Structure formats: structure tokens, C-alpha cells
Amino acid sequence: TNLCPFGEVFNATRFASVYAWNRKRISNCVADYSVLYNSASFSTFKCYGVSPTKLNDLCFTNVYADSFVIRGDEVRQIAPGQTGKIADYNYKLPDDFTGCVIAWNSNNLDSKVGGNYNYRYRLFRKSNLKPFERDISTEIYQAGSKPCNGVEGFNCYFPLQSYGFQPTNGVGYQPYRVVVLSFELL
Amino acid sequence: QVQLQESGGGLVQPGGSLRLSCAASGRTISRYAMSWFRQAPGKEREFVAVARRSGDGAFYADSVQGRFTVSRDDAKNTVYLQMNSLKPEDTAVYYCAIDSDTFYSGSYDYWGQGTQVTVS
Amino acid sequence: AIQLTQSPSSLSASVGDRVTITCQATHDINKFLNWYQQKPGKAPKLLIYDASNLETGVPSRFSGSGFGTTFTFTISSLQPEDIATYFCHQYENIPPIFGPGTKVEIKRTVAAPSVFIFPPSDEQLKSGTASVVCLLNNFYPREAKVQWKVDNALQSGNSQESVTEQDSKDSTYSLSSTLTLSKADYEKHKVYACEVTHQGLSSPVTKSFNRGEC
Amino acid sequence: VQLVETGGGLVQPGGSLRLSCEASEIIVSANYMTWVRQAPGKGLEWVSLIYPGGTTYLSDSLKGRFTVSRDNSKNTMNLEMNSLRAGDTAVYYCARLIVGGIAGMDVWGQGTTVTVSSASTKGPSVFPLAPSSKSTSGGTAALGCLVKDYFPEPVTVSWNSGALTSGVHTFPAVLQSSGLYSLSSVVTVPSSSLGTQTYICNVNHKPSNTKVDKRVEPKS
Numbered sequence A: 001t002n003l004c005p006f007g008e009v010f011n012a013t014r015f016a017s018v019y020a021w022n023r024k025r026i027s028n029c030v031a032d033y034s035v036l037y038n039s040a041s042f043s044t045f046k047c048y049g050v051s052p053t054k055l056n057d058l059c060f061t062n063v064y065a066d067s068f069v070i071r072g073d074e075v076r077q078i079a080p081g082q083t084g085k086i087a088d089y090n091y092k093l094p095d096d097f098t099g100c101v102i103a104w105n106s107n108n109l110d111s112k113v114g115g116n117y118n119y120r121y122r123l124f125r126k127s128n129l130k131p132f133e134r135d136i137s138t139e140i141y142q143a144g145s146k147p148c149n150g151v152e153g154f155n156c157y158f159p160l161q162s163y164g165f166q167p168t169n170g171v172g173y174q175p176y177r178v179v180v181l182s183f184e185l186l
Numbered sequence B: 001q002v003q004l005q006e007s008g009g010g011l012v013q014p015g016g017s018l019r020l021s022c023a024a025s026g027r028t029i030s031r032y033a034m035s036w037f038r039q040a041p042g043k044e045r046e047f048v049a050v051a052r053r054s055g056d057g058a059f060y061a062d063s064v065q066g067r068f069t070v071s072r073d074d075a076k077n078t079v080y081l082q083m084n085s086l087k088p089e090d091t092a093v094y095y096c097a098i099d100s101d102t103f104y105s106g107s108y109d110y111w112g113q114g115t116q117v118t119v120s
Numbered sequence C: 001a002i003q004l005t006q007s008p009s010s011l012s013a014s015v016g017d018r019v020t021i022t023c024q025a026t027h028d029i030n031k032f033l034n035w036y037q038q039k040p041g042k043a044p045k046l047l048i049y050d051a052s053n054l055e056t057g058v059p060s061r062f063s064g065s066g067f068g069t070t071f072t073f074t075i076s077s078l079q080p081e082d083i084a085t086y087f088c089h090q091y092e093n094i095p096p097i098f099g100p101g102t103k104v105e106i107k108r109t110v111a112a113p114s115v116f117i118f119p120p121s122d123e124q125l126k127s128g129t130a131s132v133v134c135l136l137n138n139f140y141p142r143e144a145k146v147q148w149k150v151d152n153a154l155q156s157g158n159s160q161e162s163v164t165e166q167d168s169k170d171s172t173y174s175l176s177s178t179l180t181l182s183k184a185d186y187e188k189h190k191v192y193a194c195e196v197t198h199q200g201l202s203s204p205v206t207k208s209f210n211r212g213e214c
Numbered sequence D: 001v002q003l004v005e006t007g008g009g010l011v012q013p014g015g016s017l018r019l020s021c022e023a024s025e026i027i028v029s030a031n032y033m034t035w036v037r038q039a040p041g042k043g044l045e046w047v048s049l050i051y052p053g054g055t056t057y058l059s060d061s062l063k064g065r066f067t068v069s070r071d072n073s074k075n076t077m078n079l080e081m082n083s084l085r086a087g088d089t090a091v092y093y094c095a096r097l098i099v100g101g102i103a104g105m106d107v108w109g110q111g112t113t114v115t116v117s118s119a120s121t122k123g124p125s126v127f128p129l130a131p132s133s134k135s136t137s138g139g140t141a142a143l144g145c146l147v148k149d150y151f152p153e154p155v156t157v158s159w160n161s162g163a164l165t166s167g168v169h170t171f172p173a174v175l176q177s178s179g180l181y182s183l184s185s186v187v188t189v190p191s192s193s194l195g196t197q198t199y200i201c202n203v204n205h206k207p208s209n210t211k212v213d214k215r216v217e218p219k220s
Helices: A033-037 A072-077 A085-089 C122-126
Strands: A022-026 A044-048 A060-071 A099-105 A120-122 A160-162 A175-185 B003-007 B010-012 B017-025 B033-039 B046-051 B078-084 B097-099 B108-111 B115-119 C004-007 C019-025 C033-038 C045-049 C062-065 C070-075 C085-090 C114-118 C129-139 C144-150 C153-155 C159-163 C173-182 C191-198 C205-210 D002-006 D009-011 D017-024 D033-038 D044-050 D056-058 D066-071 D076-081 D090-096 D112-116 D125-129 D140-150 D156-159 D168-170 D181-190 D200-205 D210-215
Touching: A060 A072, A072 A085, A072 A099, A072 A175, A085 A120, B003 B108, B046 B078, C004 C085, C019 C033, C019 C085, C045 C062, C070 C085, C085 D044, C114 C191, C114 C205, C114 D140, C122 C129, C122 D125, C129 C144, C129 C191, C129 D140, C129 D181, C144 C159, C144 C173, C159 D181, C173 C191, C173 D181, D002 D090, D017 D033, D017 D090, D017 D112, D033 D066, D033 D076, D044 D066, D044 D076, D056 D066, D076 D090, D125 D210, D140 D200, D156 D181
Parallel strands: B010 B115, D009 D112
Antiparallel strands: A022 A060, A044 A099, A060 A175, A099 A175, A120 A160, B003 B017, B017 B078, B033 B046, B033 B097, B097 B108, C004 C019, C019 C070, C033 C045, C033 C085, C062 C070, C114 C129, C129 C173, C144 C153, C144 C191, C159 C173, C191 C205, D002 D017, D017 D076, D033 D044, D033 D090, D044 D056, D066 D076, D090 D112, D125 D140, D140 D181, D156 D200, D168 D181, D200 D210
8 A cells, every 4th residue: 555646747847738648547545535636736636437536446457647738628528428539639638537636726837938838739630539549640631632641731730839839818718727536447 | 032142253373262152031041952064164063072961971972072062050050161282273163052951862952053163 | 798888970170181090998908909901892911910019011100009998999190991890800709799880981081072963764764764864073072962852852761872992092981862753744845954062162063954855 | 721601691580401511632531620700891710610520529619510521421511500680691611720830731622602581583684884975084984884783792893804904893792772782893994995905894693693784875
């Protein structure tokens, strides 16, 4: 028995982009999940298939702590049965998802005067992602009938676009760090 | 029963200025539109300028565009005509007319009398 | 739904002047507003995307600015071919809604209309109908009056007017008035005339013909 | 790029109509494609949008009645309209909107006319507007064609098969009291060419497959 290394996930200095969302695989450890839900730092805390207080009373093998950065108005897409650029092309949760979605505003960390363009998202994709699928490809998206041949332009767009995170952006356009906990339920 | 009294005009210097006037008595002006015409010897009844409303603008002719100026004083019922750059091709008798439509269709009923304007 | 308030609906000015169109969003759309230009009867063309970026091939006289809720669309020098309707559209909040629109006209020198009249054709008279057309060509301003007189009897309610959009080139209008009567009613009278009252006319101009004469 | 709308026309109210959008230069299945309608005399109104992964979206006033499908074999956008209402009478455009602020991406179609009203189709009658002395002023003469009594919109009018374009005014159609549209298309030419030049207007009313060439000669 030992506490889960959740500090390394939530209190990480830098977060991965949503298209390359990082996954932390943790064994069946113990953690006061009731304290996490009762943390004032988390503005979004939605659980599916299980209550936040009854998380310790679950029987599972591995818990996955997926983490990434999206904007404010896209947090609604980190939920089962959602559509949009994030849910279809970046990070997709299954319909029978068992776990919780945690998010909080990170404007003070991920925004920079003049714009922070380090965080990216997949804008073009031929098909929707399967649940828990990750796509880091940088193939030039052929939106036209003519092949691109690794040359971008009209009808040939880079599938990834950078967020424009400025401190003066609206709250719907400010960066939000998201942590998704999933359980390989036994 | 209204009439258009005019003043100003006369033998002015070539290239000078002149302030025309056209006062009307018996009916107000703030809800109508007044115009200005020109009758040179040889041709007849050309167009000069006009004022739409208080909140609208003025509209001129092809040969006087950007050269004349139409003011409007509805409190005294006297619409002036600021005039600059008098060329000798404008030696004519200037008139004054009034529009009889609030939709500015161009209903000309009452006229002026004439103002002798001679350039050099 | 995010309602867009684009004002004014009409800002007629002259060629070479500055244009300023304001668009207001009910909610916050950040910088994601697109300005489209639509010629009469043509498809809309994108001019400004992301409220401040010119599109490919668009002349540089067009410009945009603003973020959050209020946006501005500015034409540095208004041009003849710039005469169209301009809409603002937010595209990142479903449902995406357009603006009300701004009909851009031109103000210019007053030009009197050339008045022409066309008697009904012999082909139409064999069909039992007579249409008399009165033409007002290349005039400004748009405000004009056409009065149909038939044997000096003024006609009301049997004619229809149609005005062309302000021509891009000379900034003028054209108007057609079509007086429609039955063949029997057309043969009852002799003098058919349209009386044109316009600003550029010192006195109303009347064009007339007599039925059955050269 | 070339987007061509088709499948419009006139339909009885409550009927179903399928709008097609043939696409060249671009692949339909891998693009953001929108349908936008504009009512006659009104402004633009977004109708539908489809993502490059299938994800569709509809307006509230049109949800549950319209459907945007895509076809990769023909590279055509499809908009199926069911339970049509009088307010749906508008011109529909299929366009590939700019996504992510990428310049040169936006491209619109020509547009198709859909008329949701209970009426019949009638071809226009074409009558000459003969020039004369009463049509001559300042060395120019006016002549035209009267495209009268047709339904529904639109008609197209050219002169000398497109060779005569300078000075052509095709007035917008007006709806007569009989419920039929009427339109005049006039052209100003030098009066000296009335007796020597041939002037022919070409009227085309696609909703009734009516093509009429009418020569306009003077007689006065």
C-alpha cells in the first residue's frame, strides 16, 4: 500500500498539448479521492459511472491519469457522448466511461503577453478518433482532389493549429488544464 | 401664397466669391428641400445644387461639384448659397426653387425671380 | 444564439471617402468574426477573416479591427467596384449567425434621367394585352416620380416600377415603369404619356405618343 | 475550385427536395462544408454545417427537417429538405468555409433557387421594345425586350449572345397582380446603327425550359 503520485500529474510544471495528450499509468494505489473533490483549485469536477467520494471503494487494476491543455469553451467536450473538434479529433471519451473529468483555469501559467502558441490541437482529420486514441501525425491534410506531396497551401493544410493564449482573452478562450482519471475496473 | 425673395449677386470680380440668399415667407423650410439653377445665354436651366434635410447632405452637378456650398438655416427660413471660384463660364442668371415633396421626388412648383451674376 | 448587430444598414457615400461599419456580438466571440462582401445577385466573397486578417487577393484598402464583442470594418478609400452588401459573421459558436447587413450605395453629382417611352408591340396586342414602358436611364439621386397619363387622365394602380441597383461605374440608377392594360381598354384612348418628376429636372418631363401613329 | 448547385426549382409546400452540390478541385469527404440560404430581399442565414469527420450541425429553425449528407463517389454535397415551408423559399449556397484562419480556403457556390409555394410553372412571352425617335437622345437609342408573365424566378437575358454588354440594364423582375413575374431588359446603342446592326435578346427561363431569341428592329 502507498499513496498515488497524483502530485506529479496535477502539479506538473508543463502540460502536453491535447493532440499529444500524456497518459500516466498508475498501479492499484490508495488515494484520498474525497480530498481531491473537496479541493477549491478545481473548477470542473464531473464523474461518470462512479461518485467522487466512493472512488476508493472501487475494484480495479490500473488507473490512468490523462492530462492536456484546452481552452475554456472546449471543456464541455471532455465528456461521454460529445462532439466537436476536441472530442472528434483530439481526445475522445467512451460512452461507457468510468471515471472523472477534472479541469481548472490556467491563464496565469499558460498565457503570455503577445500570445503563447506552444499548445496545439488537431484541426483536420478524415475520421473521428476512437475512445482513448492519440494522433501525433503531421501529414499535410489533403483537403483537395490534388495530392499535396508534403507541400502545404490551398487544399493542403497542416492538421495541427496553435492556440492563441493571451492573458486578455475571454474565459472561453483562456487555457484550461484538464486531468482525466479512468479505471480499468475489476 | 408663399414667395421666394432673393438677394445678393451683381458684378463680382473674376475668380472671387459671392453669397446668394433665398428667403421664403408664409411657410417653414425645415420639412422641405430647396434647389438652385442656372440659365446661361445659349443654353437653359442647368442644375447647380440642393439641400435634402437637416440631417442629410448636399448634391451638386458635374461642373460645380466640390466648388459650391449649400448652407441651411431653418430657424430663420433663409437658405443661403456659399459660392467660390467664380469662373467666366458661369456668367448667368441664378434662380431659386423649392421642392414640393417630402420624399424629394423633385416636385418644383414655386420659383424665384433671378439674380444678375456677371463675371468680369 | 449570438445576435450580431451590424450598423448602419446603409451608409451611402462618394468614391474616395472612408467607410466604417460596426458589428456587435451579444456574447464574447474573441476575434473570430468574418466579413463577407456580396454583389447583387452574386455569391458572398470573404474579405476579412479573424476580424483583422485580409484574405488572399483582397485589395489592401480593406481593413478590420476589434475583439471581444465590438468589431469594425473599414474601407480606406471607397471605390466603384466596392458597391455591395457587407455582412459580419461569427463562425466559432454554433449556431453561427450573420449580421443584418449594410447596403453600400454611392452619393455623387445629380444627373437628370433620360426619358424614353415604348408603345406596346404588335405581337403583344394580338395577345389581348398592351404594355407601355417608360424608361428612366442613368440618373441620381434615386428618388424620382413617374406619373402615367392617358388622355390626360392620371393612371394609378395599373403600373409597376423596377429600379436597377446603383451602377458600379457611373453611380447612377435606372428605372422602368410598365403600364399594363387590356387590348380593348388600350384602344379606347389616344394619348399615352409618362410624366417624369426628378430633382435634376427644372420642370417635369413628359414623353408621349398617340395610339396608331408613327 | 468550382462549386455548382443544382436540384432546386419549385416544390409544393410540405414536399421534399434534395439539393446537390457538385465539387471540383476539392474532396468533399475531407472538408468543412456549409449550406447557407438567403431569403429574397433578406440577409444571409446559416442553414447547416458538416465536419470532415461526419459531425453535422443544423439551425434551430431547420433542425429535424433538413439533412446534410456527403457522397465520395460523385464528390457531391447533398442537402435533403423535408417538410418544406413558405419561409424556406430562398437561394441556397454550398460553401467550404475558412477553418482555423487559413487564407485562400473560403470558396462559395453559384447558388440554387428553391421556391416553396403552391402555384404552377409558366414560360415567359418575349416582346420587342422597338427603338424610334422617341427612344433616341444624345446620339444614342434605347431598345429592349419585355419578358412578361413567367413563374417562377429566375430569367437570364443577354444581347447578341453576350456580344453586347455595354449599356445593358436588365431590370429586376416585379411580381404582377396576376402572380406572374415581369421583367424588362434594355440596352442603349448609337442611333446610327439602328438601320444596319442586328440586335437580338436571348431570354432563358430554366424552370420551364423556355429559350426565346427575339430580334428587336425599329419601326416608326
